[PDB]
Write a protein that binds this ligand. Structure first.
Ligand SMILES: Nc1ccn([C@@H]2O[C@H](COP(=O)(O)O)[C@@H](O)[C@H]2O)c(=O)n1
Ligand SMILES: Nc1ccn([C@@H]2O[C@H](COP(=O)(O)O)[C@@H](O)[C@H]2O)c(=O)n1
Ligand SMILES: Nc1ccn([C@@H]2O[C@H](COP(=O)(O)O)[C@@H](O)[C@H]2O)c(=O)n1
Ligand SMILES: [Mg+2]
Ligand SMILES: [Zn+2]
Ligand SMILES: [Zn+2]
Ligand SMILES: [Zn+2]
Lengths: 153, 152, 153
């Protein structure tokens, strides 16, 4: 099986009175994520990891001027280039709020959008131990990893 | 072959009054990690829970050390029906030099995972003096793991 | 099919006057990368990614040789340890300049250096949303992932 690795990264600034959306889950919080989209740091990092495993460039090469629509269009472009998806793993870095009670909603959103069962989608949460702009609550980071297979039939 | 990718991250603060323990090797040094706070073992553990779709550290573990945790992770990953292909990792530490301690780290990681040494890699990097990492205020580890869901 | 994952990281400070070289592509820009090589963050992170997957240590356990010479020697050692390369994916975090019209040149330098077709090499570019030393333009980062098969069969 012609297996391929992808990896992806995003970051957004956190600012007062904007909504916090992560992995398509809205998380009540007094700060929220600034970007030209709905600033979904997790879905973008996964969208990059899929384009990267497929050697299709990056989101910018695709989408310029919400984040689930983008994730689904990514999956459709990846499938048309002849790949099927093995699994996704990811980490979100946020000093707060606590993300654990939200993670299952994120997994559901990502699995629907990629046409995968739940068991092939993982999301992990981490603080940054109060270090740097992440640990000071000024930004949130996501990292993703994805495994594809180029068919192959 | 139902292959899966796992990736993991950790960071801890460096401070006076703590021993420095990375990959279960104690590295003599005037500073050490705050948290048993082994950044390398924790990152690898998250990467295996990740590849196995079993969530993360916090979802599993609320006196036990980072090696006990890594071995418990292994057992849960194997129970869920997975086999481990290999691990690779990077530790970002401005100082001290980790190179002569790296093979002791690999041995500790391979034993805890039931792997030969040839399926375990650890790498070390400075941060070129940039950021809290480059200023000696913290240490980072990054890991990647490849599993196979049996598939027997 | 004995598949192996590697991952790789590098960072370099940006300083006025010096040349900016990433992925072996020289990018005209008012700042440039310090290091004792030609400090090519992207080539190095890919280099570590390959030594990682092959469990052969890191660039320091191996190494007047530029970063392309190092990447090719990396590839020679990986092949001689009985490995074949499935693919490479990577990200470069640089707040500026735009890397997109340079990305095909990097992919070409890497594919030649790894002896891979273009369709197995991907390079992606991110800003850091003006956060941290990356966001202030005082450094650039590269992340990389690589997939190897130990032959095997
Ligand atoms: N230095 C950079 C940073 C970003 N980019 C491109 O801009 C697009 C959007 O970047 P941000 O999402 O970081 O704003 C990226 O996907 C990449 O296409 C670039 O071409 N050069
Ligand atoms: N923002 C965050 C950060 C961490 N967590 C949970 O807290 C646990 C411990 O996190 P730290 O080790 O980063 O302190 C994590 O494994 C995750 O389970 C969370 O639920 N929301
Ligand atoms: N704390 C550290 C950081 C780097 N190193 C070693 O030094 C080499 C050079 O690392 P840098 O490229 O980050 O300067 C690494 O490949 C690794 O061999 C180390 O042995 N301990
Ligand atoms: Mg980082
Ligand atoms: Zn984004
Ligand atoms: Zn930890
Ligand atoms: Zn470098």
């Amino acid at each position: 099986m012609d297996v391929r690795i992808g990896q992806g990264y995003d970051v957004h600034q956190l600012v007062e009175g904007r909504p916090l959306i992560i992995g398509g889950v809205t998380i009540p919080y007094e700060r929220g994520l600034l970007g030209h989209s709905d600033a979904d740091v997790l879905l973008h990092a996964i969208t990059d990891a899929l384009f990267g495993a497929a050697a299709l460039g990056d989101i910018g090469r695709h989408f310029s001027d919400d984040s689930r629509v983008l994730l689904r269009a990514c999956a459709e472009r990846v499938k048309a280039a002849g790949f099927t998806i093995q699994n996704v793993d990811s980490t979100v870095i946020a000093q707060a709020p606590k993300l654990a009670p939200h993670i299952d909603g994120m997994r559901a959103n990502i699995a629907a959008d990629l046409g995968l069962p739940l068991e092939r989608v993982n999301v992990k949460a981490k603080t940054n131990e109060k270090l740097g702009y992440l640990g000071r609550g000024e930004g949130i980071e996501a990292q993703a990893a994805a495994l594809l297979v180029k068919q192959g039939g």
